[PDB]
Amino acid sequence: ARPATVLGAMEMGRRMDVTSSSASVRAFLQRGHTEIDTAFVYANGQSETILGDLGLGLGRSGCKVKIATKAAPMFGKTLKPADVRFQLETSLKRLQCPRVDLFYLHFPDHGTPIEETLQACHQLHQEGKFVELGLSNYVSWEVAEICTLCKKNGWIMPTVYQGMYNAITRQVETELFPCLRHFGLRFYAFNPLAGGLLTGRYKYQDKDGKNPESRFFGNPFSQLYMDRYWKEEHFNGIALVEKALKTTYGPTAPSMISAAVRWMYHHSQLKGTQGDAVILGMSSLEQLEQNLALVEEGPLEPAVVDAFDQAWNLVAHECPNYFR
């Protein structure tokens, strides 16, 4: 079976107003999907707030919708016990819910010993504030340390890892994926479109011109994205794929975005039977509706799959790290 689809709620309350956010949730649920991904930091708290007002009854026995949130060592907070508790308790209030289904450590706090953070997570779990524990942006060997500590201490083990993965960003495959398989974590991929770079709407020289509001220009985290993906090699690879699309399908070929999405669902190492999933991103209802349709499309012809491999090969030596 194909990977699951998770709704990324990062723009809810930022570029997306309440109306469009609500519409997006409805569209996503109508497609049969159930999991929504937000975070304490998203839209400075508005993503969670918007979601918690939809009258969905999050965290209550009988909710078919599953909610994930995250605690982050940012905005002046760390992953010390008190700060982890502060974030989760705040998220529960914003989400108007008694427990979240999945609670992540958003990214590492290298200034707080991990066992301290984990002990806090275990206590919060024992209080009934979350069902499953997740990690994001931890290196493979940190995941293994965490799982070993949890096992030895009798603490809830993480069962989900959320990481950066797309057709031209595959660092996770080598060391992380086998670790996750070993310890029993399912993988949820973010940046499936490389923040929009894999839609093909950009050109390298673009950064040297004025650009409309987007992930790469005008976003609070645009610099992070330029450093991550704005490299000549990423652009040359996309170019190979666009060429193979035409050569194989002709002017009726699937679009670059269609290709990139289908790669995630049909040609990646993600496995539906392992519970793996793709987190869709969007900055408008229109984009989401488009993407939701693309998820249902089928596999690509081999020549195009080969082109994506070629593109990955071109950029591998400068792939952004999946860990921080």
Ligand X SMILES: NC(=O)c1ccc[n+]([C@@H]2O[C@H](COP(=O)([O-])OP(=O)(O)OC[C@H]3O[C@@H](n4cnc5c(N)ncnc54)[C@H](OP(=O)(O)O)[C@@H]3O)[C@@H](O)[C@H]2O)c1
Binding site listing: 10, 15, 37, 106, 137, 191, 193, 195, 201, 215, 225, 228, 283, 287, 290-291, 324
- Write out the binding residues for ligand X, residues 276-295 only, by CB under 6 A: 279, 281-283, 287, 290-291
190 binds, among its own copies, ligand X, none (CB under 5 to 8 A by kind): ligand X
At 303, is the secondary structure helix, strand, or coil? helix
CA angle 254, 260, 261 (to 5 degrees): 90
Stretch of residues binding its own copies (CB under 8 A), selected from 88-96, 168-176, 207-215, 270-278: 168-176
Give the residue, chosen from 78, 214, 269, 313, that forms a contact with ligand X under the rule CB under 6 A.
214
140 binds, among ligand X, its own copies, none (CB under 5 to 8 A by kind): its own copies
7 binds its own copies (CB under 8 A): no
The neighbour count for residue 283, using CB atoms within 10 Å, is 18
For helices 114-126 and 81-94, give the axis angle rounded to 10 degrees: 40
Closest CA to 51 of 61, 41, 38: 38
Contact between 276 and 14 (Cβ < 8 Å): no
Q: Which is nearer to its own copies, 143 or 259 (CB)?
A: 143
Q: Which is nearer to its own copies, 141 or 204 (CB)?
A: 141
Residues carrying an active site annotation: 42
270 binds its own copies (CB under 8 A): no
Give residue 97's identity as a one-letter amino acid code: C
Q: In the complex, what is the shortest distance from the CB of residue 64 to its own copies, in angstroms, rounded to a whole number?
A: 35
179 binds, among its own copies, ligand X, none (CB under 5 to 8 A by kind): its own copies
Residue 9, both tokens: 């709620």
- Write out the binding residues for its own copies, residues 123-162 only, by CB under 8 A: 139-145, 147-149, 152
**Cα 107 to the chain's mean position, in Å?**
12
CA distance 16 to 117: 33
**Residue 154: left (phi > 0), alpha (psi -120 to 50), or beta?**
left
67 binds ligand X (CB under 6 A): no
Give the residue, chosen from 52, 108, 192, 237, that forms a contact with ligand X under the rule CB under 6 A.
192
Residue 76, both tokens: 């002046």
Q: In the complex, what is the shortest distance from the CB of residue 137 to its own copies, in angstroms, rounded to a whole number?
A: 13
Handedness of CA 285, 272, 234, 162 (dihedral sign): positive
Q: In the complex, what is the shortest distance from the CB of residue 4 to ligand X, in angstroms, rounded to a whole number?
A: 13
The residue length of the chain stands at 324
Residues at the binding site for NADP(+) are: 10, 15, 37, 137, 191, 193, 195, 201, 215, 283, 287, 290-291, 324
Closest CA to 51 of 18, 75, 74, 78: 18
CA distance 111 to 44: 23
CA distance 113 to 249: 53
- Write out the binding residues for ligand X, residues 138-167 only, by CB under 6 A: 162
Binding residues for ligand X, rule: CB under 6 A, are 8-10, 37, 136-137, 162, 190-196, 199, 214-215, 257, 279, 281-283, 287, 290-291
Binding residues for its own copies, rule: CB under 8 A, are 139-145, 147-149, 152, 171, 174-176, 178-179, 182, 312-314, 316-318, 321
